[PDB]
Amino acid sequence: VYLDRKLLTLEDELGSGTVKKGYYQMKKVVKTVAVKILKPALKDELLAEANVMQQLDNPYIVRMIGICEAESWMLVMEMAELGPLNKYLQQNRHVKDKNIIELVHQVSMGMKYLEESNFVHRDLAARNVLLVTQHYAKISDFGLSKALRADENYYKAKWPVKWYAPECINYYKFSSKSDVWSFGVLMWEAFSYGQKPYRGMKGSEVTAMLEKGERMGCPAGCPREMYDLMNLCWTYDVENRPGFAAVELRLRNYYYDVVNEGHH
Ligand SMILES: COc1cc(-c2cnc3[nH]cc(C(=O)NC(C)C)c3n2)cc(OC)c1OC
């Protein structure tokens, strides 16, 4: 959890606090890492972030190496060389539909685990799915994430409104079902090859559209089954909206179906 700064080697910027690629000399190897670096509230956020990641043990969730205090406060995590899913698909338009399915199923597996762990993510978007390889996705960015109280199935709170469920907007209530809503948006982005959802619309206009029972259209080349899954994620009523255990299963099965044809 606590790291020796002199074992860390930063490069002179992935994004902009800032995220920078670095090297942490480990027990025997040198490990490539991503380092989140800050510009009191800001410092406690980072430790809260680190506390959440510490509690999570799953192949489809970014792993924290530890925290560092030097020039600035620094959060050191495993590196995802291919970066954010939305950018990847934007620059790689010929990624196959099967490959996209495989990646979003991987995200659902990570989310299924987060649910069983009683954590809400609250920033689940394609920008926060990071690619270790073209066939290996991990969930990142636990800056807004909350551990649910033992006696509550939701957390009561700028928001990424286009990814938030009606109950988040209407009642400030975040649950795993809210994350499922965000996952639908993320699915939409993945099949739209990393285009922004609700193009040209303001936050308030989105809320209005959703209130009328309208949902985003089926992306070009997206299988009807995956668009059916998207819309089910976008179930307005929280009770009728599926959980991640159901979602992961629907994706597991349809991925295995598609794989079977790739041979047939
Ligand atoms: C390889 O290209 C990029 C890679 C990354 C990146 C890679 N590995 C990571 N591990 C934890 C991260 C992390 O905490 N990321 C937060 C920014 C979500 C994180 N971000 C981020 C990028 O832009 C943000 C990139 O595009 C230049």
Side-chain angles (χ1 to χ4, degrees):
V1 60
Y2 279 110
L3 307 181
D4 183 10
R5 174 68 187 88
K6 68 193 163 187
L7 320 186
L8 170 71
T9 314
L10 315 157
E11 278 150 348
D12 45 10
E13 204 160 323
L14 303 159
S16 191
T18 71
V19 60
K20 286 187 185 203
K21 182 181 169 179
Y23 302 98
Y24 192 76
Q25 160 61 48
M26 301 286 268
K27 294 144 268 286
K28 188 190 193 162
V29 295
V30 156
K31 197 179 174 64
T32 310
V33 290
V35 185
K36 176 185 174 163
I37 315 157
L38 303 179
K39 293 157 169 147
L42 204 74
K43 297 103 220 317
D44 289 331
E45 287 159 32
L46 197 63
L47 298 174
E49 196 171 354
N51 186 46
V52 170
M53 302 187 61
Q54 194 175 245
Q55 304 178 66
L56 312 173
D57 190 12
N58 192 261
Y60 305 104
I61 294 173
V62 169
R63 286 169 156 91
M64 175 190 61
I65 305 306
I67 44 173
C68 186
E69 188 190 346
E71 317 92 81
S72 340
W73 274 100
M74 284 169 281
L75 176 59
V76 176
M77 300 154 292
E78 62 171 310
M79 172 70 174
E81 298 284 353
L82 276 51
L85 177 62
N86 63 331
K87 296 307 172 168
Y88 191 82
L89 303 167
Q90 281 171 12
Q91 298 145 30
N92 296 279
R93 258 88 207 277
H94 301 313
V95 168
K96 291 288 171 270
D97 195 83
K98 176 171 77 162
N99 190 172
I100 294 172
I101 300 161
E102 173 190 38
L103 298 179
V104 307
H105 173 236
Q106 286 176 352
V107 181
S108 67
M109 289 192 279
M111 283 320 286
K112 184 174 187 157
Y113 165 88
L114 214 50
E115 182 185 73
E116 294 159 358
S117 303
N118 297 119
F119 277 88
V120 298
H121 189 283
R122 300 176 72 234
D123 207 5
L124 182 61
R127 64 179 170 274
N128 292 323
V129 175
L130 304 180
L131 292 182
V132 175
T133 68
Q134 202 190 310
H135 302 272
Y136 189 10
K138 295 183 158 286
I139 299 154
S140 67
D141 192 353
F142 293 89
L144 292 175
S145 300
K146 299 294 176 174
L148 297 177
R149 285 180 46 157
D151 63 343
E152 295 303 313
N153 90 319
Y154 70 89
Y155 164 83
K156 184 70 160 61
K158 297 185 288 271
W159 284 350
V161 154
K162 297 191 176 194
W163 289 264
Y164 279 6
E167 74 276 11
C168 304
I169 307 309
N170 295 323
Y171 301 101
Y172 321 123
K173 288 176 60 162
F174 300 77
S175 64
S176 280
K177 295 290 181 75
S178 313
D179 277 347
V180 164
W181 184 286
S182 313
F183 183 74
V185 182
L186 180 165
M187 280 182 74
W188 187 95
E189 302 174 82
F191 287 98
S192 310
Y193 288 82
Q195 93 162 64
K196 305 179 285 281
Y198 307 101
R199 172 161 85 190
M201 299 175 69
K202 45 191 179 185
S204 66
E205 285 171 338
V206 177
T207 313
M209 196 192 104
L210 295 174
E211 196 161 314
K212 300 200 280 176
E214 300 172 29
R215 300 300 181 261
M216 279 181 298
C218 191
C222 181
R224 177 52 51 162
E225 296 94 314
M226 295 288 91
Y227 186 62
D228 294 337
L229 183 61
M230 286 181 207
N231 269 288
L232 178 72
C233 291
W234 299 326
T235 303
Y236 195 100
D237 172 62
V238 183
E239 246 201 319
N240 291 298
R241 197 180 305 151
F244 276 118
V247 168
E248 193 274 331
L249 182 63
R250 285 279 303 271
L251 273 165
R252 193 198 298 178
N253 292 342
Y254 186 72
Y255 180 56
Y256 294 166
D257 275 348
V258 167
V259 155
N260 178 51
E261 322 315 305
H263 305 302
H264 272 315

